[PDB]
Structure 1
Amino acid sequence: MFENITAAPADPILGLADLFRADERPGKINLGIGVYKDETGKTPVLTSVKKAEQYLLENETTKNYLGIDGIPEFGRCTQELLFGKGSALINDKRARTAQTPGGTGALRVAADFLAKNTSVKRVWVSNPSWPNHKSVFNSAGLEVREYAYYDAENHTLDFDALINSLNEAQAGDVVLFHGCCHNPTGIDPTLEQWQTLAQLSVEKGWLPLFAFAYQGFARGLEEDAEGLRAFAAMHKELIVASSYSKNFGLYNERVGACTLVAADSETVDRAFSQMKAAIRANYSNPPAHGASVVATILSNDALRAIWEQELTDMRQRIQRMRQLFVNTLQEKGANRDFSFIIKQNGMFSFSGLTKEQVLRLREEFGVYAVASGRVNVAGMTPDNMAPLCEAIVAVL
């Protein structure tokens, strides 16, 4: 059976952790994957989730299976964080969320649902985008098409071109948007542009799939959901795949959510029973620890208040590092003006480096970036800021 099976290409993001850990040169710098690090270069588990894990250890009685859709308290808090305290989707029983194994689990379950229960042929994804989008939809059966986004010269969102390529997206097609913190560019639309986009979507009949992985890392939790909320107010149907791996630092417990909205409660519930049938034939029900922890923190005032400060601290450290990277690049030789990275939101930096410059930085200096030029800013500390800036100058 297995004789002619060729090896698969390494994952562009995930494959770097392999090489990084096989390196054995003492001064290497990882900069690759979107995991946060502190001034010390470590990824600590948050104080607020430790407090919650202690609680759960003292307070659980059973490990018996969860429902297909997971914990109810989890699903209701997720809806509030995304849609608003007193929203109409919530009050009209127009939304249902299932707890998933991470945001990728949420994206596959949506893909599986639409493939089986809809007439969707195409999903539209931005150029550039998270590399694994194309792979989750292709395994479900769906064609991936691209819409222009970001012009490289002026380091801006090229709005007129995003309109003009989406003009050939048919009524019925899926269109993925990033809620906030575009991966990999870090360039999101203004609220005025999101308005212009909510409009058009309704004029043309596209189904919006919103992807959230970084809510809280751009301006704040509420401020970052205003593009999704501008769309909710105009739409009858929407699906959103959400993740809590980044803003809760719960990367390996696999906590996310796939939330479905339709016109009324009867229609969302008919649809949701199909979504649960797709879940049952993949894993059977969701992992409990991670989501049990989110709900506990979100349900307690003391623990919620501590969490939001911990996340405010991470957003601010990343901002300090963004400017330091730019000031240092200029002090050490940079032949280009890299001011434009101060204008991007999130963990990343679409630096502009060519694939050969990225390949060299790795080979000769051991600093690890993705071959697109994306570098994780939250990987940078005061102590490794001069080494890696020097290393870039040499390769320019």
Structure 2
Amino acid sequence: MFENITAAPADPILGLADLFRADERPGKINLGIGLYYDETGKIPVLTSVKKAEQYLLENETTKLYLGIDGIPEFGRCTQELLFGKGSALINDKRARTAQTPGGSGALRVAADFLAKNTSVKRVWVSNPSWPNHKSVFNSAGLEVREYAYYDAENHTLDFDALINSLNEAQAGDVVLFHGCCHNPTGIDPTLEQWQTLAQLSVEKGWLPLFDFAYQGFARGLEEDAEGLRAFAAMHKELIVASSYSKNFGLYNERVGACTLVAADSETVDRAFSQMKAAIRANYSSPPAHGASVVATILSNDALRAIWEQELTDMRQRIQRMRQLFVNTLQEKGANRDFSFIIKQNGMFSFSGLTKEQVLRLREEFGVYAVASGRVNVAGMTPDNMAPLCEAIVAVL
């Protein structure tokens, strides 16, 4: 039965982790997978999280299955982070949120839901994009088309090309937007670009799907939600797949959400019943730990305060490694000007290195970056900066 199964190709991101592991080379540097490291180079558990955990340890009395859609407080809290304290979306009971296993499972849930209940035939993702997007949608039997987005030459957002390629997006097609901190580019539309995009989609008939994995790493919690919030203001229907992996460092606990928005409560209710059905036929009910952690922190002023600061610290430290990266580069040779690297948001910079250049960094110098040239700034530290900037220079 399995005789003729062809090995599949390794995840272009997950893959490298393997390789990374397997490499005995003493001074290896991992800038591939998007994980936030700290000055010491470790991937720590937030203090607000350890606190929330002790709290559960002490207060949990049952491991009783959660509801298909998970922890109600969790969805409530998610809806507020997303749309804001007093959104009409909330007051009008227009949004329903399902706790899912990471932003990843949220995407899948959304896909399955779409494929099976709407006549959505294609999904438009950006080029470049996050590698896993294709696989998720494809697995649900949806077509993935790509829309232009980055200007290699100028290291920026090519609005025209953006707009010019979406012209072929039919009405009823799904258009996927990254809420903030575009992965892998780090280039986001300005509030105005967003407002335009939002006008366009309504006019053109697209269903927006927000992939929101880095809320809080660009500017701030509220600030990072402006584009969505702008869309939510003109849209009747929307989907939001969001993750808490990064902003809470709860990577392995698989904490995410899938929010469905509809013109009205009755509609969002009916529709969400089908989303629930799709989850049932999948993993049934979601993992409690992670999300409990999240709900505890977000609904306790103190822990929340602690949490907001850790996030700020996280965001700030990445910003600092950013400027230090451009400086060290310069100060170390570098033919190219890497200044554009400072105007990018999030954990990564699309460095502009070639595929052969990255192969070489790895092979020769032991630095791991993704073949697209995407580096994880959060993985840079004062201590590895030099040796890392040296390897880059030697490959220029």
RMSD of aligned C-alpha atoms?
A: 0.5
Distance 1:309 1:261 in 2: 30
Distance 2:263 2:28 in 1: 53
Structure 1 distance, partners of 2:136, 2:26, is 36
Matched position secondary structure for 1:99: strand
Deviation track 1:248-271 (CA, whole Å, cap 9, x = no partner) reads 000000000000010110000000
Deviation sequence 1:97-143 (CA, Å, 0-9, x none):
00000000000000000111000100000000000000000000000
SS in 2 for 1:349: strand
| 1:4-40 deviations in Å (ceiling 9; x for gaps) | 1111011110011111111111111011010000000
1:183 matched to 2:183: yes
Q: In the TM superposition, what is the alpha-carbon distance from 1:203 to its structure 2 partner?
A: 0.7
Tell me whether 1:30 sits opposite 2:23 in the alignment: no
Counterparts of 1:143 and 1:299, CA distance in 2: 39
User: Take 1:159 and 1:150, find their aligned partners in 2: how far apart are those partners?
Assistant: 8
What are the superposed Cα offsets for residues 322-355 of structure 1, whole Å, 9 maximum, x if unpaired? 0111111011110011100011000001000000
**Counterpart-to-counterpart distance in 2, 1:377 and 1:121:** 36
Per-residue CA distance 1:294-337 (angstroms, 9 max, x = gap): 00000111100000000000111101100111111011110011
**CA distance in 2 between partners of 1:182 and 1:26 (Å):** 33
Aligned counterparts of 1:156 and 1:62: Cα–Cα separation in 2: 51
- C-alpha separation between the residues in 2 aligned to 1:370 and 1:300? 38
**Structure 1 residues 132-167: Cα deviation after superposition (integer angstroms, max 9, x where no partner):** 000000000000000000101111100011001000
Query: Matched residues in 2 for 1:89 and 1:393: separation?
Result: 50
CA distance in 2, matches of 1:49, 1:280: 29
TM-score between both structures, scaled by the size of structure 2: 1.00
The SS at the match of 2:45 is coil
- Deviation of 1:82 (Å): 0.3
How many angstroms apart in 2 are the aligned matches of 1:42 and 1:307?
Answer: 18
SS in 2 for 1:27: coil
Distance 2:162 2:186 in 1: 16
Structure 2 residue aligned with 1:13 = 13
Amino-acid identity (%): 98
In structure 1, C-alpha distance between the alignment counterparts of 2:394 and 2:50, rounded to whole Å: 43
Question: How far, CA to CA, are the matches of 1:139 and 1:47 in structure 2?
Answer: 37
CA distance in 2 between counterparts of 1:108 and 1:218 reads: 25
TM-superposed CA distance for 1:44, in Å, is 1.0
Query: Quick one: distance in 1 between partners of 2:173 and 2:364?
Result: 45
| SS of residue in 1 equivalent to 2:352 | coil
For 2:205 and 2:336, the matched residues in 1 are separated by 43
3-state DSSP of counterpart to 1:384? helix
Partner Cα separation in structure 2 for residue 200 and residue 377 of structure 1: 33
How far apart are the structure 2 equivalents of 1:174 and 1:287? 28
CA distance in 2, matches of 1:27, 1:241: 37
Corresponding residue SS for 1:260: strand
2:166 corresponds to = 166
Aligned residues: 396
TM-score normalised to structure 1 length: 1.00
Q: Distance in 1 between matches of 2:326 and 2:60?
A: 49
In 2, the alpha carbon distance for the partners of 1:334 and 1:365 equals: 16
SS at match of 1:202: helix
State the alpha-carbon separation in 1 of the partners of residues 32 and 203 from structure 2: 40
Distance in structure 2 (CA, Å) of the matches to 1:393 and 1:72 = 51
Q: How far off is 1:68 after superposition?
A: 0.4
Give 5+ residue unaligned stretches, structure 1.
none
Alpha-carbon deviation of 1:46?
A: 0.4
Distance in 2 (alpha carbons) for counterparts of 1:52 and 1:363: 42
Q: Within 1, Cα distance between the matches of 2:301 and 2:232?
A: 28
Once residues 227 and 44 of structure 2 are traced to their aligned partners in structure 1, the CA distance between those partners, rounded to angstroms, is 31
Q: Any gaps of 5 or more consecutive residues in structure 2?
A: none
Question: 2: CA distance between counterparts of 1:306 and 1:373?
Answer: 35
Q: Structure 1 runs of 4+ off > 2 angstroms?
A: none
Separation in 1, partners of 2:314, 2:13: 22
